[PDB]
């Protein structure tokens, strides 16, 4: 419950709306209890008066009471559901902004120890589960407490002992039953989320290794232990339905004890008179209708356990420290930058094998370097040292013979222009996908770069306004790569880092991109990381990587002259 505190701070903003939504959940819930309590007394008072005393009985007052109490629970529930959800949606915006802002400083580093495909889908669900602490846990538990109170003080005028033993029974269950069920199911909720991720881990490895499991005759041995995990998993699910069934059955044996008690106890006199008459109904029907206040409460033990898990899961992800530390010196961006590296070493967190054994690399200004390697040599790990995703444990990285760690982030992002290996297509419009490169560019300025990189087909049928993202037009793999270059061109920076810019492309579009990179980026330093061998003659130096090492270095012609790994690349 202490990990639920950082997000209760977010709830302090928009406290008014949240308080008003709770208040309407009390007026509605008191009208519901008051409609049945007054109806039960009105029926009992009319029956005791009988046909005699038609004019003697003041039936108009309850009749307008049962009409007002009925309207304010139909209308109150309407605005309770509006203010509660509207206030929830405002907190959701603060939760989304808080989570995003606490994840940017560690966006490539703090999230690299997880599987990023399923981590961020879990983060979005964790924020949605945190956003519903108010609707599922806070609004019922706090709305039930101040209805049990108003009913207790409300009925204390007629008889103290009845109101104190109805309010006492209702208070006891409110304060004691959610904790005893959150405690009883605490182990299962831990077991449920552990067996769920184990079944996902065993199933994914069963599907991926299906070719290997089938041949080696383990596809059935590894399915039996997969189906035994599901049996364990379904058993944990079954035990949560034994606490949802028990809490639903216990709340019915408590709302039954408070009706048997207000029948037996309120028949021995309500206050002074030994024969209360109509007052018995007002206490039996109150105890009958007052346990709908606790109906939302009987499930709030299951929802509190989930919200707590999300609070812990989000926190320990965003409460860890960024790998890099950006100074505030506020330097000025250079016009031309030279890249220098000396013995850069880097072991990924929680690993025992070095990703970068040692890198020596000099890239003068206006020089086009290419880095060659196979899968997993460590080349895209080198580019993330230059953008300061990580810090090399041993080694020094220089920009214009000044350490790269001495640049404030706003200046580093203006010195480095990078096209990633995995180009990300944002959901927003085509103009917005380019305006992140340079916000100040104009529509014509965006258009010239877009048609210059060969993406002129995106300039038709409201092309610059087409949605072009998820829930919209999806760009092809070849077109997506041209989009990445269009951002690198718009975001003019002295040094341009490329990460497999021609991966998975036919030679027709591979040549078009390669010729586009040599002519547009002629005056800008380029460090292109390549898995292919096409069009490497225009590069002043080719650096061949192998298992985190620079095994070969030199110009294209020089590399062919001396027999080595680069020679083995063309001729196997």
């Amino acid at each position: 419950m202490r990990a639920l505190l950082p997000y209760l701070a977010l709830y302090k903003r928009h406290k008014w709306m949240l308080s008003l939504g709770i208040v309407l959940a009390i007026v509605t819930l008191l009208a519901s209890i008051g409609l049945l309590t007054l109806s039960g007394w009105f029926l009992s008072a009319s029956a005791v008066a009988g046909v005699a005393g038609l004019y003697s009985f003041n039936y108009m007052l309850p009749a307008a009471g049962v009409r007002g109490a009925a309207i304010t629970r139909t209308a109150g529930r309407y605005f309770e559901r509006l203010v509660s959800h509207d206030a929830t949606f405002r907190v959701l915006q603060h939760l989304r902004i808080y989570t995003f802002s606490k994840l940017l400083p560690l966006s490539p580093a703090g999230l690299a120890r997880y599987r990023q495909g399923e981590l961020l889908n879990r983060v979005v669900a964790d924020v949605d589960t945190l956003d519903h602490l108010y609707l599922r846990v806070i609004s019922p538990l706090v709305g039930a407490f101040v209805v049990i109170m108003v009913v207790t003080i409300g009925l204390s005028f007629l008889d103290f002992t009845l109101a104190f033993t109805l309010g006492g029974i209702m208070l006891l269950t409110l304060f004691l039953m959610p904790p005893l069920f959150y405690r009883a199911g605490k182990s299962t909720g831990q077991n449920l989320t552990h067996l769920r991720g184990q079944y996902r881990q065993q199933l994914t490895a069963w599907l991926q290794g299906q070719a290997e499991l089938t041949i080696f005759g383990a596809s059935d041995r590894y399915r039996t232990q997969l189906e035994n995990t599901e049996i364990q998993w379904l058993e944990a699910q079954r035990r949560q339905s034994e606490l949802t069934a028990l809490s639903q059955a216990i709340m019915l044996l408590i709302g039954a004890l408070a009706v048997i008690l207000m029948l037996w106890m309120a028949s021995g006199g309500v206050g002074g008179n030994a024969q209360p008459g109509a007052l018995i109904a007002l206490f039996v029907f109150c105890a009958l209708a007052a346990f709908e206040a606790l109906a939302p409460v009987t499930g709030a033990f299951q929802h509190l356990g989930q919200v707590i898990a999300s609070a812990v899961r989000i926190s320990d992800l965003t409460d860890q420290k960024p790998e890099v530390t950006f100074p505030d010196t506020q330097t000025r961006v250079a016009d031309r930058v030279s890249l220098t590296l000396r013995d850069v070493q880097f072991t990924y967190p929680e690993q025992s094998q070095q990703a970068l054994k040692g890198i020596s690399l000099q890239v003068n200004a206006g020089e086009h370097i290419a880095i060659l390697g196979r899968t997993g040599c460590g080349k895209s790990t080198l580019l993330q040292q230059l953008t300061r995703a990580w810090d090399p444990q041993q080694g020094e990285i220089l920009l214009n013979d000044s350490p790269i760690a001495s640049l404030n982030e706003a200046a580093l992002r203006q010195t480095i222009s990078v096209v990633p290996q995995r180009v990300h297509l944002f959901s927003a419009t085509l103009r917005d996908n380019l305006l992140l490169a340079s916000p100040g560019s104009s529509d014509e300025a965006l258009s010239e770069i877009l048609r210059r990189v060969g993406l002129e087909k995106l300039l038709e049928d409201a092309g610059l306004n087409s949605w072009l993202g998820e829930g919209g037009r999806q760009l092809s793999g070849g077109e997506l790569r041209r989009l990445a270059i269009a951002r690198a061109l718009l975001h003019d920076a002295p040094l341009v880092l490329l990460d497999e810019p021609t991966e998975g492309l036919d030679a027709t579009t591979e040549s078009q991109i390669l010729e586009l990179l040599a002519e547009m980026m002629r005056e800008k330093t380029v460090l292109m990381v390549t898995h292919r061998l096409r069009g490497l003659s225009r590069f002043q130096q080719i650096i061949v990587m192998d298992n985190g090492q620079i095994i070969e270095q030199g110009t294209h012609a020089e590399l062919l002259a001396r027999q080595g790994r680069y020679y083995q690349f063309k001729q196997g």
Binding site: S39, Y78, R96, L263, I280, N547
Partner: protein, 587 residues
């Protein structure tokens, strides 16, 4: 929209036959639940009348108290019982659908599983089968409690008063009518905001994903205002949708509180001499008003719970949308057989007019003709996409072939897969380690092996030369989430696992494709001394120093065009000259 949704619901009803015994006890206990609701409402009404009208003391009503407590205890037992049977009904359907999905995925094989990412299948099996629970556990048992219980109240009140039973029954045709008038208005707001709402739902995950791109452009601070201005739009658009969604719900709470208001007023005035109508001539009774008043809120409770459980129908048909198409795809797969190979000697492979067909039905390899006698090792060379790996999947049994492909003279499709695979062993292009530890992967072919022959496997493959690097030695839990092995290190484990058992055919598939210099020469050396012991079919890109392999096959669009010794193909002009002389080596 209405065409598919009708077809999906019949699919859900088809699956409910699994655990139909428990979907009946849920329906039977729902009727008994509505009887105990009436019994306790009658017991309370008769207790309360005696102590309010004729002032009978509580100590003379011990029998109704005793029966009222028992009714309350029985009610709690039924609610406890009904939840457990509802879950039991839900999980048999999930347990059986998950077996049909996993049986379909296992029989389809790696040829079809590779079509989608392992997280796309894991959503089908985990997320979308678990989405169907609350349809069978809550919504279906509630759609039967919503029609049985409210009719029991009307049937139990009609004998005592026909207007009290008409107040409740008068809102039975009013709620669906009014809920549909607001439905016409809702469809106006829902459809206008449908495009944008689905457009803004995936916004936060889209900024969260690809947060690297925002970092490398320095736009992390200007996208806070994008999240702020896409959450203001989402909230405003969805609240105008929700003004009509909570109004449709409010119809039930309007008639819930009007039905308790009219019952209170009609009975209240009936006791005061007014409103003499509505009751049979015998007379008016206080216990006949308590019984109707206690049961009026319980008339709509089954219809109010159903409002909360209705979302379980939408997420069970969306689950059924992607589960029906999964089970309805034709997925033609290789024919299983019963004959088996007794001999463990190297096999002879000959194919006449052999065609490899994709699981969907298209052909991946054309009319292949080749013959590979026992003990002879062949090598497959060709351009990318030439059907090189489709031939290796057919020999593995993963793909269906229409032509002829014989193993020792016995047709492959007439060979029992569970025995053919014991004579089969290969190393793929990518190391797929599906076992927990590094020793469990090596021993995956035969787990009951002693250390002597385990230690021999590691040394023969040079898996033991990087063991000191690993933290726990040979028992390290391996993976991308624990003790990452480089592609060179994981490929040597895949070689060690493949060479653990003697085999008849070794289908090495581009093993040294993406490896560093050291592991490439350690994997290739081990598999050059392993290809000799049995007939071997390799596919490779590095066609230099390929002379010692006996017969070389060259593939073109799915046809073996040229064959023979390396010397004969190398010197002679032909397609092998084109592959070798044009040493482009694009990667």
């Amino acid at each position: 929209n209405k065409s598919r949704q009708k077809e999906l619901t019949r699919w859900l009803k088809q699956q409910s036959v699994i655990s139909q015994r428990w979907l009946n006890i849920s329906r039977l206990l729902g009727f008994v639940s509505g009887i105990l609701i009436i019994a306790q409402a009658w017991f309370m009404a008769r207790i309360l009348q005696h102590m309010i009208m004729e002032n009978i003391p509580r100590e003379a009503l011990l029998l109704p108290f005793t029966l009222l407590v028992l009714t309350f205890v029985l009610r709690a037992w039924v609610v406890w019982l009904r939840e457990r049977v509802g879950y039991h009904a839900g999980q048999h359907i999930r347990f059986a659908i998950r077996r049909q999905v996993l049986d379909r995925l296992q029989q389809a094989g790696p040829a079809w599983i590779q079509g989608k990412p392992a997280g796309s299948w894991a959503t089908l099996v985990l997320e979308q089968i678990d989405d169907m629970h609350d349809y069978y556990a809550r919504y279906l048992p509630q759609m039967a409690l919503a029609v049985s219980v409210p009719l029991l109240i009307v049937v139990a009140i009609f004998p005592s008063n026909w207007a009290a039973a008409l107040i409740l029954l008068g809102t039975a045709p009013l709620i669906p009518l009014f809920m549909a008038l607001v439905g016409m208005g809702a469809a106006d707001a829902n459809r206008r905001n449908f495009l944008a709402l689905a457009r803004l739902s995936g916004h936060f995950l889209d900024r969260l994903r690809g947060m690297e791109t925002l970092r490398i452009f320095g736009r992390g601070e200007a996208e806070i205002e994008s999240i702020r201005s896409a959450s203001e739009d989402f909230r405003q658009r969805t609240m105008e949708v929700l003004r009509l969604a909570f109004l449709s719900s409010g119809i039930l709470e309007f008639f819930t509180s009007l039905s308790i208001a009219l019952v209170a007023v009609y009975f209240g005035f009936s006791y005061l001499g007014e409103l003499d109508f509505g009751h049979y001539d015998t007379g008016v009774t206080l216990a006949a008003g308590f019984l109707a008043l206690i049961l009026a809120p319980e008339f709509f409770q089954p219809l109010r719970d159903l409002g909360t459980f209705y979302h379980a129908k939408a997420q069970a048909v969306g689950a059924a949308d992607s589960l029906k198409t999964f089970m309805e795809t034709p997925l033609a797969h290789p024919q299983r057989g019963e004959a088996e190979l007794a001999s463990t000697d190297p096999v002879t492979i000959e194919a006449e007019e052999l065609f490899i067909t994709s699981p969907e039905g298209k052909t991946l390899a054309g009319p292949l003709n080749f013959t590979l006698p026992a003990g002879q090792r062949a090598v497959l060379v060709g351009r990318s996409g030439s059907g090189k790996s489709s031939l290796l999947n057919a020999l593995s049994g993963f793909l269906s072939y229409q032509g002829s492909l014989r193993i020792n003279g016995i047709e492959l499709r007439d060979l029992s897969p569970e025995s053919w695979r014991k004579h089969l062993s290969w190393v793929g292009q990518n190391p797929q380690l599906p076992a927990a530890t590094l020793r469990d992967n090596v021993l995956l072919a035969r787990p009951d092996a002693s250390e002597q022959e385990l230690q021999a496997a590691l040394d023969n493959a040079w898996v033991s030369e990087f063991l000191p690097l690993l933290p726990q030695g040979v028992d390290t839990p391996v993976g991308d989430q624990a003790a990452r092995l480089s592609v060179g290190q994981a490929q040597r484990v895949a070689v060690a696992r493949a060479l653990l058992n003697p085999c008849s055919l070794l289908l090495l598939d581009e093993p040294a494709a993406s490896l560093d210099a050291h592991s490439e020469q350690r994997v290739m050396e081990a598999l050059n001394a392993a290809s000799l012991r049995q007939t071997t079919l390799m596919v490779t890109h590095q066609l230099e120093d390929l002379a010692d392999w006996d017969v070389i096959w060259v593939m073109q669009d799915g046809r073996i065009i040229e064959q023979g010794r390396y010397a004969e193909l190398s010197v002679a002009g032909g397609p092998f000259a084109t592959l070798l002389a044009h040493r482009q080596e694009e990667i």
